[PDB]
Structure formats: C-alpha cells, structure tokens
Amino acid sequence: GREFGNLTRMRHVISYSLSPFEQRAYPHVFTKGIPNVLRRIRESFFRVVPQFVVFYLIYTWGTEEFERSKRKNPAAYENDK
Amino acid sequence: MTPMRKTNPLMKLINHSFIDLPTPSNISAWWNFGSLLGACLILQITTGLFLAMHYSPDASTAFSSIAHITRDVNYGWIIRYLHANGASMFFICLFLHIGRGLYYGSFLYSETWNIGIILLLATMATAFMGYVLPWGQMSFWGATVITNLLSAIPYIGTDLVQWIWGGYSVDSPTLTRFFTFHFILPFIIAALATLHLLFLHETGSNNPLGITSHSDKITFHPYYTIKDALGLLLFLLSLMTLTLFSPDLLGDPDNYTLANPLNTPPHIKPEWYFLFAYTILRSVPNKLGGVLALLLSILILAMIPILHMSKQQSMMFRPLSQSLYWLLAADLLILTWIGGQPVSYPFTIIGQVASVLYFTTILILMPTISLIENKMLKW
Amino acid sequence: TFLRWASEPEHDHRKRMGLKMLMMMALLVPLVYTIKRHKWSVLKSRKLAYRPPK
Amino acid sequence: SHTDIKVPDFSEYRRLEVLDSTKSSRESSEAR
Amino acid sequence: AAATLTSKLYSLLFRRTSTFALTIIVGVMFFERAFDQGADAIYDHINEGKLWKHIKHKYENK
Amino acid sequence: AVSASGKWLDGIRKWYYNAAGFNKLGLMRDDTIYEDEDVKEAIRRLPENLYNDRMFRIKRALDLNLKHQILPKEQWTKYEEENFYLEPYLKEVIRERKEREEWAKK
Ligand SMILES: COC1=C(OC)C(=O)C(C/C=C(\C)CC/C=C(\C)CC/C=C(\C)CC/C=C(\C)CC/C=C(\C)CC/C=C(/C)CC/C=C(/C)CC/C=C(\C)CC/C=C(/C)CCC=C(C)C)=C(C)C1=O
Numbered sequence A: 001g002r003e004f005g006n007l008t009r010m011r012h013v014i015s016y017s018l019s020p021f022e023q024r025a026y027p028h029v030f031t032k033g034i035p036n037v038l039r040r041i042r043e044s045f046f047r048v049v050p051q052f053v054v055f056y057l058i059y060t061w062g063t064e065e066f067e068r069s070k071r072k073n074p075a076a077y078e079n080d081k
Numbered sequence B: 001m002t003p004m005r006k007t008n009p010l011m012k013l014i015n016h017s018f019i020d021l022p023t024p025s026n027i028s029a030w031w032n033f034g035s036l037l038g039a040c041l042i043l044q045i046t047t048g049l050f051l052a053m054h055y056s057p058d059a060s061t062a063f064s065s066i067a068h069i070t071r072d073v074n075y076g077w078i079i080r081y082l083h084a085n086g087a088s089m090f091f092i093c094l095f096l097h098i099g100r101g102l103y104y105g106s107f108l109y110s111e112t113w114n115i116g117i118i119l120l121l122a123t124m125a126t127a128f129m130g131y132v133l134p135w136g137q138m139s140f141w142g143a144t145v146i147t148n149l150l151s152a153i154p155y156i157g158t159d160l161v162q163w164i165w166g167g168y169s170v171d172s173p174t175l176t177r178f179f180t181f182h183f184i185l186p187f188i189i190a191a192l193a194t195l196h197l198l199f200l201h202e203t204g205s206n207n208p209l210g211i212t213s214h215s216d217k218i219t220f221h222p223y224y225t226i227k228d229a230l231g232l233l234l235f236l237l238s239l240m241t242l243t244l245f246s247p248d249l250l251g252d253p254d255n256y257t258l259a260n261p262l263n264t265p266p267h268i269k270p271e272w273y274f275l276f277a278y279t280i281l282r283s284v285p286n287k288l289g290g291v292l293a294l295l296l297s298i299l300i301l302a303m304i305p306i307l308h309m310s311k312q313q314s315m316m317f318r319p320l321s322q323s324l325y326w327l328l329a330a331d332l333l334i335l336t337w338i339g340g341q342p343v344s345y346p347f348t349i350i351g352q353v354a355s356v357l358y359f360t361t362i363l364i365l366m367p368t369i370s371l372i373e374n375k376m377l378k379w
Numbered sequence C: 001t002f003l004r005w006a007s008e009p010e011h012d013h014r015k016r017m018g019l020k021m022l023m024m025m026a027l028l029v030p031l032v033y034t035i036k037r038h039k040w041s042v043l044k045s046r047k048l049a050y051r052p053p054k
Numbered sequence D: 001s002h003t004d005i006k007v008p009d010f011s012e013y014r015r016l017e018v019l020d021s022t023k024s025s026r027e028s029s030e031a032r
Numbered sequence E: 001a002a003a004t005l006t007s008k009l010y011s012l013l014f015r016r017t018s019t020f021a022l023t024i025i026v027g028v029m030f031f032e033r034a035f036d037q038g039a040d041a042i043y044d045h046i047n048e049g050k051l052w053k054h055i056k057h058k059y060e061n062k
Numbered sequence F: 001a002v003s004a005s006g007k008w009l010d011g012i013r014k015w016y017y018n019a020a021g022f023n024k025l026g027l028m029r030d031d032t033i034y035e036d037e038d039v040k041e042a043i044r045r046l047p048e049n050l051y052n053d054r055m056f057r058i059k060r061a062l063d064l065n066l067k068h069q070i071l072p073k074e075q076w077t078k079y080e081e082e083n084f085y086l087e088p089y090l091k092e093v094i095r096e097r098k099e100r101e102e103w104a105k106k
C-alpha cells in the first residue's frame, strides 16, 4: 500500500506523453494560458473579495471614529464661561 | 548489479522519504510551505549559531554586545537582520501551513495533526524567549507582562513566577536561563518534526480534491524537487528583499533603547505574530478568564477534527463553508489590527465582537452549515 | 544626516547588495521557472483514454 | 482491437523544428 | 546552412558531463568579475558626488 | 404535499449542485464522499464495471486539476442524469455496523 508496485487495481486505461525535448516549455501561453487564469479568478471572485472589503470598511470607520473622539468638545466649553 | 540505494540502510531511509516517495500529482503550492518551514528552521539554526559566538547573555552587557556585532563584526548586521526577519517568515509560512489543513481537511490525519499542535507551541516558546534576548525596552517589559500572567493560578501563583524569574523580579538570572532555553528548543523541534513526518508517511499526502489519489501517484525526486526548489527561491527572494531594503519594517522601535525597570512606554504592544491572542486576553476583564481564553484558543485546533460533520474533506466543493472560512480569516486580521492599537472605546468593543465571533463561528456555525449542505445534497 | 549614519553605517553597502540581488533574481527566477516547466511538460500535455472491453 | 489505437495529435505542443512528419529529427537533436 | 551555435556548444561541451562542469565553473569565474564590475559601476553612476571615493580629490595628500 | 415549496426546494438544490464544481470535472456525487472504512468496504462490494468507471473518472479529475483546466461545457454532469450507484451498498454497510453495536452493548 506504500510501494508503487502495489497501490491500487486499475484496468482499461491508456496514457500518452511526449518527451520534454520534443515540446515547448511555454505552449499557447498567450492565447490559451491567460484566458484560463481569467476563468480561475472570475470563478472565485465573489466567494472571497467581498468579505475583505467589509474588513476595509470596518478598518476605515474605526480610525475615523478614533480620531473623531480626540477632537475638542464645543459643548463642554459653551457653558464653562 | 541492483541499485545501491536499496541496500545501504542510510540510503533506504533517504529513498523512502525523498526519492521514491509516492506523492499525488495535483498538489498545489499550498503543499510547499511544509518543506519551506524546515528550510527556514535550518536557516535560523545556522544564523543563530553564528550570533551566539559574539553574544553575552548578561543583563549588563547583552545590549552592548549586539551594538558591537552590528558595528565591528564582519557582516554582523546582515546576520542579525537575517535572524530577526527570518523569524517573521517562519510564522507566515506556519500560519499558511495550518490554514491549508483547515481548508482542505488535512486534520483528519489525527496523529500528524496533533504532532503539529505540539510543534506550534514549541515554536511559539522559542520565538518569545528569543525576542527578550536583545534586552530592549520592549523585550524587558514584554517578558514581565507575559510572565506575570501565571499569577492567575488559584493557589500556587507567585511560586511559579518567582521560580521562573530566579528571584523577585526579571533580571540577569532570567536572561541566562532564557538564553539556554532559546538555544536548545529549536533542536527539540527538529526531533518533533521527524516524528511529524514519521506518522505522515504511513498514509501519504492528501490531494486538494479530497478523493483517494492512489491512481495518480508519481515519484518525488524529479518533479517536486524542482517545484520545491522554486518555492525556496521565492522564499529567499522575499526574505532578502525584506532584509536588504526594509530591515526594520515588521519590528518596532524602543528595542534600540536600553531597558529601564522604572520607565515604561505607553503602548507596550507585543510582536505582531503574538497579537491576535493578546486582544483575546484584553477582551475579557478577568485575568483567569483571559488566560483560559488564550488556552481554549489553541485547544480549538485539537477539537476541530471532532467538530467535522460534512461527508467530504475539502471545502472546494462546499461554497458556504468557504465563505465562512474567509470570514474567519478576516476576523483574525481584525484581531491582529486591534492588537496594534491603543486601548480605547471603539477598539475595545470591536475586539470583544471579534473574539466572540471567532469562537462562535468555529464552535457553532461551521457544524450547522455542514449539516445544511448535507441536506441539500440528499446524502 | 550624520545621525542617520551613526545609527546605520551599513546603509550604502546594504543597498549595493540589494541592487545585485535584484538583477540576480531577475536572471534566475525566469530560468528556474523554465526548468520547472521543461520537466513538468510531460505531465501537462499527457492525454488519457478509457477503452473498456466494449 | 489493439490496432484501432492511434496516438492523438500533439502538434500544438511540439517544437517548431519537428512539427511536420516528413523531415528527420536526427539533425535537430543536438540543437534542441 | 551553418550548424547552429547551440549544436556546436552541445557536441563539444555539454555531451560530456565532466566538460559540462568544467565550462560551468569557468563561466562562473568570468561572470563573477563581469557582473560585479558592472553592478558597481551602475551603483556609483547613480550617486556621483555622494560617495566618499569621489570626494577624496578635494582633500588628499595634505 | 407542498408544490411551491417543493419546487423551490428543487430549484435551490439544483442551484447548489451547479455551485459545487465537481460536475465541471465529470464527477458524480458519490465520488466525492470521504473514504472512511465503511466507504472502503462499500467500494469493495461494487461490480467491476462501476468500479472501473469510478477509477477512470477520478483519474480524469485529478489530471484536469493538475493543469488547472476545466472540462468543456457540453461534458459537464447534469443534475437530473446522476445515478446514486453507491447509496444502496453504503446503507447496507452502515446498518450492519449499527446492528453489531446494538448487540455489543447487551
Ligand atoms: C503571550 O503570548 C504567548 C502565547 O500566546 C498566548 C504562547 O502560546 C506562548 C508559548 C508556550 C506555551 C503553551 C508553552 C508550550 C510548551 C513549550 C515550550 C514546551 C516545548 C516542548 C514540548 C511539547 C515537547 C515535550 C513533548 C514531547 C517530545 C512529546 C513526544 C510524544 C509524542 C509523539 C507522542 C504523541 C504522538 C502522536 C500522533 C500525537 C498524540 C497521539 C496519538 C495516537 C494521536 C492522538 C489522537 C488520536 C487516536 C485520535 C482519537 C480519536 C478520534 C475520532 C477523536 C476522539 C475524540 C474524543 C472527544 C474522544 C508564549 C511563550 C507567549 O508569550
């Protein structure tokens, strides 16, 4: 079960391969590669991105509220007189 | 006439682990960090060994020793920065190494998963005692706070703190023992790592799909050697860029001022990799509550395998679980960010909400949605 | 400026080594990736077929 | 039968020098 | 019709691994000098006047 | 029985099925189940033809995942054509385990 000699029992399968020296290292990396990457990105965009956008909104508001708190209070001095 | 790597005992082990190891062919980059972790360890070890030849583990000369390394020792500054920056890289890979298992369901390998928890705790201890060695303001006070956290024990309390300190406060004796412990633990982690790999080989690696890969296994020597040799090159690229262009970015000033037992800086925030737990502590007013929270945090990782309810390993085929996963990650980012900010109204409330959300998501939401997905699949 | 030096006298040397590192990586990263693609091509182009007895 | 099997075309992936099935690959070997 | 440069480089050097190693190490010997000198010249040209070696002239030999 | 709710249930299940990407690789639902000892025995009881088909489709899926490719649209698995071939065998195995456990406690 841990040696290539005996791992599983398969039947009726064929495989075809070519030598590394008989083929290009970057085949269709301009017409077929980029579109596949775009498919990958698009297929998982809405599953991740939006949550991290919420994080950014929480981060900005926080900082804004923190600084907003340190501003002096005109309502604590109107009557101080 | 037969190959000589199948007779010599020392070559049998190398052949099993490295050359003729059956490995799934579709494993992605996520499976590379494992190797990188060991590589980073091997780097740290050597880098630290060279720093030990010029470091004086004494409270009155440790700080001056480092200043001498960076100004008089040939290429001492680069060695020091490589050690410091290489520690952050360790944690980054370690967090990504743990996230992969959480996502793809590698925790089902009980033995291997449990060994990892131990490895994590051992590495966390190593990094904490290393950070106190420089004897800067942050180093001195960070140890004080973290060491005073054992006073919450019901009846023993002070005894452990005074025992660890070797006195009534933090001073030279504490520094010396920490230096020795810092030196030794990494070698203990190496032994644990071998046990980690040991239990792993019995079953093999898990593919991203989660289905049995016994039909598409390939050898490791020609394919994953170069693939893991490309990852290490990228790892070095990132590390060298950090060291050679922004030597002090993931650190914090006040480590370049001599430690003062009397003066105390205001923020006194710990290291970035020990920030999420720090916020969890501050979220609970009670000391005993906070320490239990910290521990309960790590313990969740051990309980995660028990909380699994879906009939699939990978979340690749379970989008609702994926969305929850990413929300949990964002929550961890918020925890880290809060840890870096002073104690104030908005941060405190946000930290409490993040902490409760963290725990609830893991302990409640994940099992429930897993059952829901089993229902929509008519399992 | 003098103080910035006194706290970092390896400034010039640090950046010179950085410059060399950048050019060396630029040459190396594409090369190593090419070797990876070369070795892996045999797997990336593999074609499979299933021919049961009928 | 085992004779119906025939290798599918790999033309897309092949190097420019060995695209056609007419010229010998022996001469290009050293170059490739 | 001339045999390609790579083909000649292969038959004479790359075919025998020992010569393949020999040419590698000689190339390292040569490339090290070339790369080092080129990088140093670029760095100096980016910062004329700043580097002290360009300042020695104003004060030297008493 | 409820018609509108049942149709809504069917619609949302079909939506979830399409959201799961295993149909994109020609995989049936029963191929994705985690392989515990119960599943291992269930697979051992499959007839040769179904076992052979299962292995080949897993190989194709692994091969596609190797190169980050996707099977053509026309060849994607359809929600209505799927056959739950493994359900009867797995159910019998689980029931046998329950009977053994029930006996074992008394
Ligand atoms: C404030 O900031 C900070 C933090 O943050 C809050 C921190 O943290 C820390 C960090 C420090 C700490 C916690 C300290 C941590 C400890 C250390 C430095 C000590 C380091 C050294 C070690 C642990 C090494 C000592 C132990 C050694 C060598 C152990 C060797 C033993 C083994 C291999 C045997 C174990 C073997 C195997 C596989 C794993 C366990 C055993 C197994 C068979 C598997 C077990 C599981 C099972 C069979 C599964 C059971 C079944 C099923 C389904 C589930 C059952 C479920 C049920 C509910 C029953 C610091 C400093 C900090 O400053």
Ligand code: HEM
Pocket (backbone or CB within 6 Å): B030, B031, B032, B033, B034, B035, B037, B038, B094, B097, B098, B101, B106, B107, B109, B112, B113, B114, B115, B116, B117, B119, B120, B123, B193, B196, B200, B204, B205, B206, B207
């Ligand atoms: C701290 C130093 C560590 C080292 C040196 C180390 C080493 C490794 C290596 C080299 C691998 C093989 C990678 C692969 O095949 O994908 C691996 C796998 C694994 N590691 Fe670690 N690891 C460490 C920490 C951890 C931690 C903290 C965990 C937490 C759970 C963990 C859990 C796992 C698991 C579950 C696997 C198996 C993944 C699979 O089967 O797909 N490891 N480890």
Ligand code: HEM
Pocket (backbone or CB within 6 Å): B041, B044, B045, B046, B048, B049, B050, B051, B052, B055, B066, B080, B083, B084, B087, B090, B123, B126, B127, B130, B131, B132, B133, B134, B182, B183, B186, B187
């Ligand atoms: C995983 C293993 C290790 C980790 C994570 C680690 C981490 C650290 C960290 C973060 C620091 C402080 C860096 C700074 O303050 O900028 C440090 C300091 C140090 N470590 Fe370790 N270390 C490890 C292994 C070792 C080993 C094996 C040695 C053996 C001698 C060692 C010796 C030292 C020394 C001498 C210092 C002093 C740093 C200085 O003087 O600037 N470390 N370590």
